[PDB]
């Protein structure tokens, strides 16, 4: 309804003193699919929904606040120190009480093993991201088994994100060998160390259950369990209305209307750094391998109309996202989309200059029709995106062939392997925006699914990560963004409204925006608990 889709500095979580909440309870949430791999560092396990679930179970070195600021999570680390600024040396000192769910203590070996596994040194690890691990020169033992000193060969401002935010620490048994990394977590997660532990994976009931970790050495959680139910997008709001789940996202105006009409449901809003997009495939043999064709096609997709249709009534003055690196409300955000501003007449002119002429119902060249397979995850909103782009592209002689898909293998079986010309999906960021550059946009980026890149983009990413000054680094990242747009890599569409529908009884849970949850503090309020001191 009235707030802008822009990242702010607040959470909307109905903060309450957890000691005043009920003792016990079952937080019921939904999942889109069982993951094909539970290793969230793996190229097949980089699923935001699963990572979100795992945050309740795995160590994270820092707590992120609603403004993106970090503090050391002393449950997992006695201290974390920038031992030396340049060359960068970081000393992680592990909380001696920290233990994995198999009794093994957390040691420096877990940090060393994880950094090695995602460093790119050994190509056998099929990783989703390096999070700058390729920039560490060494991980060595500090004063005892519980201390790791990470020495960098190159600057890396966002080192705090290695084991925090969307990053988190895995046990060496799951990262030490390519076999365990790639295949050890196919049927379920390995050992963990957090307030909750995954205790049940029911593929028949399509349910995953998290219960209190017996070995947890920190604050006892208020919840007995967190239960995830597999539900398709259309089933989510009805499940909330029928009292089968307790919270779910609100992605459309009609969803907001249904949720807000529902007794016992509250609407929380805190936009986070996540967005939806068209990603283009430029791999050899793909029709969009031609850069000029990518830029021409892009000029025929009306991202502004798409954003207005997607977000009207849900957010105020809806606009599309115009940046790959920063989103609205973030420092450094700016509009770098002009190289592919919507211009159908110019698109037609450029298509003619390339020999994609109106020889038939759609444009043609060398006996091939100008058809673009659009791969997306079938749902009402995503089909809407596809349909609008289809309409505008048809108007310039371009045929968008919709290829809607479903299931656990949307990424592992289609996106990850280049089975598309355009793919619609979302990226889910955190407080560390620069860490996406090497992952997605570098020529050898592990998540560069479309294999689109250039030496100029690579060099601009290098300059961005070498820069120690934050403002200059933001400038350099925006130059990177300019190059990304000019390469026809992808078209950002909408960033997240941050609207969530939550059972009104829940406290310390809701729309978090940039912030982490304290999973020990989530709980249900007692009857007639109607005060709100926050």
């Amino acid at each position: 309804a009235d707030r802008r889709a822009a990242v702010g500095t607040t959470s909307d979580i109905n903060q309450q003193d957890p000691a005043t909440l009920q003792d016990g309870g079952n937080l019921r949430l939904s999942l889109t699919d069982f993951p094909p791999n539970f290793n969230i560092l793996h190229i097949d396990g980089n699923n935001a929904e699963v990572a979100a679930m795992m945050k309740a179970t795995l160590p994270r070195a820092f707590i992120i606040g609603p403004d993106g600021s970090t503090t050391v999570d002393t449950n997992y680390f006695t201290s974390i120190e920038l031992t030396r600024t340049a060359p960068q040396v970081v000393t992680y000192t592990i909380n001696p009480e920290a233990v994995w769910s198999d009794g093994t203590p957390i040691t420096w070996r877990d940090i060393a093993s994880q950094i090695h596994a995602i460093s790119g040194a050994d190509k056998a690890f099929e990783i989703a991201s390096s999070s700058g691990a390729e920039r560490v020169a060494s991980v060595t033992r500090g004063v005892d088994d519980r201390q790791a000193v990470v020495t960098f060969a190159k600057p890396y401002a966002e080192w705090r994100g290695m084991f925090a935010g969307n990053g988190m620490l895995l046990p060496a048994s799951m990262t030490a060998t390519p076999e365990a990394f790639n295949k050890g977590q196919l049927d379920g997660p390995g050992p963990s160390a957090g307030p909750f532990v995954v205790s049940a994976l029911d593929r028949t009931a399509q349910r995953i259950v998290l219960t209190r970790n017996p070995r947890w050495w920190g604050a006892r959680p208020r919840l007995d369990s967190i239960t995830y139910l597999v539900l398709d997008d259309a089933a989510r709001l009805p499940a909330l209305q029928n009292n089968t789940i307790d919270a779910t996202g609100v992605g459309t105006l009609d969803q907001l209307t249904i949720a807000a009409r529902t007794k016992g449901i509250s609407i929380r809003r805190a936009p986070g750094p996540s967005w939806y997009h068209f990603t283009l495939n430029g791999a050899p043999g793909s029709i969009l391998a031609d850069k000029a064709l990518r830029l021409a096609i892009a000029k025929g997709i009306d991202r502004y109309t798409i954003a207005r249709v997607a977000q009207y009534g849900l957010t105020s003055d809806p606009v599309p996202l115009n940046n790959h690196v920063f989103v609205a409300g973030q420092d450094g955000y700016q509009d770098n989309s002009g190289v592919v501003a919507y211009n159908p007449e110019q698109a037609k002119r450029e298509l003619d200059a390339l020999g994609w002429r109106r020889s038939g119902a759609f444009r043609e060249k060398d006996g091939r029709q100008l058809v673009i397979r659009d791969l997306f995850y079938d749902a009402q909103s995503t089909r809407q995106f596809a349909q609008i782009a289809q309409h505008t592209l048809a108007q310039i002689g371009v045929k968008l062939e919709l290829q809607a898909k479903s299931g656990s293998g949307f990424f592992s079986d289609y996106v990850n392997v280049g089975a598309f010309d355009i793919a619609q999906f979302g990226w889910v960021g955190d407080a560390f925006p620069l860490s996406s550059l090497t992952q997605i946009y570098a020529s050898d980026g592990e998540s560069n699914f479309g294999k689109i890149g250039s030496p100029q983009i690579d060099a601009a990413i290098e300059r961005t990560l070498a820069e120690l000054d934050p403002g200059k680094a933001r400038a350099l990242a925006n130059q990177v963004d300019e190059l990304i747009w000019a390469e026809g890599f992808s078209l950002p569409l909408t960033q997240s409204p941050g609207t969530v529908a939550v059972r009104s009884t829940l406290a310390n849970f809701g729309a978090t925006g940039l912030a982490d949850l304290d999973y020990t503090a989530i709980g249900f309020m007692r009857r007639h608990h109607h005060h709100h001191h926050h």
């Binding site: 889109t32 969230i40 980089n46 699923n47 935001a48 929904e49 990572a51 989703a128 991201s129 999070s131 969307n166 990053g167 997008d233 996202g249 992605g251 986070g272 750094p273 996540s274 967005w275 939806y276 997607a310 995850y377 749902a379 909103s381 995503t382 995106f385 949307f410 990424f411 996106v415 999906f425 979302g426 990226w427 889910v428 960021g429 955190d430 925006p433 860490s435 996406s436 992952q439 997605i440 998540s447 569409l493 909408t494 997240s496």
Partner: peptide, 9 residues
């Protein structure tokens, strides 16, 4: 933007 999701976040 390290993890992905199939639906508009």
């Amino acid at each position: 933007a390290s993890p992905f999701s199939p639906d508009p976040p």
